[PDB]
Design a protein around this ligand. Structure first.
Ligand SMILES: CC(C)[C@H](C(=O)Nc1ccc(C(=O)NO)cc1)c1ccccc1
Ligand SMILES: [K+]
Ligand SMILES: [K+]
Ligand SMILES: [Zn+2]
Length: 358
C-alpha cells in the first residue's frame, strides 16, 4: 500500500525513425532510464506493474473514432505511406510498431492509476514512450500519437469516479494537446511551465501564453507559465511551484495528480535551453505529494539528453520512494525574468483563485 509502482515494457523500444538515424526521439531514451534506475538500486525498490494495451473505448475518452482508425491503420502501411502521413503533422515520425507501442504507453498510465486510486500503491512512474502531451483529439503532434495523461485523467474520472484531477506539466514544451482537450473543463486543472520566448520557441502558439486561462465552464482552470529567457534554474521552478502552483492546487483539492514528466528542462538537454539540475526534480516531486493524499502518477514525456533525462527520472523516483530530499547547491532565489513571468501568470489567473489574491 505504501509502494511506488513502475511500468516498463520492451515494446517501448520497438519503434524508431526509419528515415533519420539521428532522430532525438529514440529507443535509447527509455533503456537508459531503466539502466540507471537499476544501477542506482531504485528499480529494485519499486513494485513492477504490468503494462496493458489501451482499449478503443478508453482512447475515445479523448480522441475521435476517425483518428483512432487512421492511427490503427498505420501498422499495415509501407514506409512511404508512413512518411506521407507523418509529414501531414508537425514534428512527427511514424513506424509500423508505433501504434502498438502507443497503446501500451497509454495503458501503462492507466495501470498505475488503478493501483494508486485503489491504495494498492502510494504513487508510480511509467517509463513510457511514445510521449503524449502534444497529441490532440484528431491529430498527432510533437512525437505523440495519443494523449497519455489526458486519457488517464478522464479514465480516473469515469472508472474511479474521481471528481477533480490536477495535471502538472514540467516538460520544457507546452502541452498544448492537454490544454485543448480540457479547455472548457473545470474538473481537470492543467498547469504547464514551459519555454516560450514570446512564441519564438516551438510550438510557437499564442495560446501558450498566460492569457489562455480556459473558457466557458473551464475559465480559470488552465494555467500557463511561459519562460521568456533561456537558462532557468532550479530556484526558478521551485519559486513557481511555491508562489503559484501549490496555492492553486490546494484550493482546487484534486483527488489525483498526474505529471507530464519531461526532462528537457534539465541541464544538458539539446533543445530545452534550461539549466535545471536533475536533483531539482526530487524537490518538485516532493512538493506535489502534499495534495490528493499523495496520489501521484508520473509519465515520461520529453527529454532528449539520455543522461540528463535518466538522472531526472531517478531524482523524481527518490522522492516517490520517500527518500529525504537533497540539498540544492543553487539558492532557491529566482531570476528577474522568472519572477516577471510568475507575476504575469498570477495577474492573469487572480480573478479565479482566492489563493492568488493580495
Ligand atoms: C525542428 C524542431 C523545432 C522540431 C522539434 O524540436 N520538435 C519537438 C517536439 C516535441 C518534443 C518533445 O516531446 N519534448 O519533450 C521535442 C521536440 C524537430 C522536428 C523533427 C525532428 C527533430 C526536431
Ligand atoms: K510544460
Ligand atoms: K481545464
Ligand atoms: Zn518537451
Amino acid at each position: 500500500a505504501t509502494g511506488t509502482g513502475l511500468v516498463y515494457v520492451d515494446a517501448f523500444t520497438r519503434f524508431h525513425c526509419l528515415w533519420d538515424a539521428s532522430h532525438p526521439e529514440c529507443p535509447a531514451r527509455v533503456s537508459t532510464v531503466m539502466e540507471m534506475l537499476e544501477t542506482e538500486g531504485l528499480l529494485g525498490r519499486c513494485v513492477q506493474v504490468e503494462a496493458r494495451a489501451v482499449t478503443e473505448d478508453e482512447l475515445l475518452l479523448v480522441h475521435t473514432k476517425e483518428y483512432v482508425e487512421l492511427m490503427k491503420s498505420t501498422q499495415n502501411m509501407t514506409e512511404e505511406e508512413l512518411k506521407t502521413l507523418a509529414e501531414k503533422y508537425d514534428s512527427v515520425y511514424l513506424h509500423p510498431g508505433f501504434f502498438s507501442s502507443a497503446c501500451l504507453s497509454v495503458g501503462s498510465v492507466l495501470q498505475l492509476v488503478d493501483k494508486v486510486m485503489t491504495s494498492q500503491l502510494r504513487n508510480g512512474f511509467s517509463i513510457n514512450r511514445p510521449p503524449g502531451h502534444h497529441a490532440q483529439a484528431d491529430k498527432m503532434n510533437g512525437f505523440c500519437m495519443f494523449n497519455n495523461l489526458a486519457i488517464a485523467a478522464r479514465y480516473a474520472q469515469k472508472r474511479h469516479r474521481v471528481q477533480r484531477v490536477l495535471i502538472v506539466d514540467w516538460d520544457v514544451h507546452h502541452g498544448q494537446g492537454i490544454q485543448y482537450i480540457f479547455e472548457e473543463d473545470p474538473s481537470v486543472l492543467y498547469f504547464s511551465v514551459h519555454r516560450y520566448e514570446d512564441g519564438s520557441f516551438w510550438p510557437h502558439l499564442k495560446e501558450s501564453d498566460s492569457s489562455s486561462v480556459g473558457s466557458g465552464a473551464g475559465q480559470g482552470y488552465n494555467i500557463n507559465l511561459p519562460w521568456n529567457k533561456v537558462g532557468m534554474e532550479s530556484g526558478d521552478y521551485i519559486t513557481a511551484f511555491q508562489q503559484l502552483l501549490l496555492p492553486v492546487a490546494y484550493e482546487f483539492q484534486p483527488q489525483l495528480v498526474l505529471v507530464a514528466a519531461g526532462f528537457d528542462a534539465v541541464i544538458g538537454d539539446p533543445k530545452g535551453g534550461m539549466q535545471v539540475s536533475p536533483e531539482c526534480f526530487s524537490i518538485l516531486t516532493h512538493m506535489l505529494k502534499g495534495v490528493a493524499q499523495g496520489r501521484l502518477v508520473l509519465a515520461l514525456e520529453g527529454g532528449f539528453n539520455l543522461q540528463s533525462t535518466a538522472e531526472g527520472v531517478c531524482a523524481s523516483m527518490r522522492s516517490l520512494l520517500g527518500d529525504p530530499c537533497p540539498h540544492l547547491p543553487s539558492s532557491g532565489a529566482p531570476c528577474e525574468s522568472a519572477l516577471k513571468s510568475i507575476s504575469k501568470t498570477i495577474s492573469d489567473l487572480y480573478p479565479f483563485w482566492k489563493s492568488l489574491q493580495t
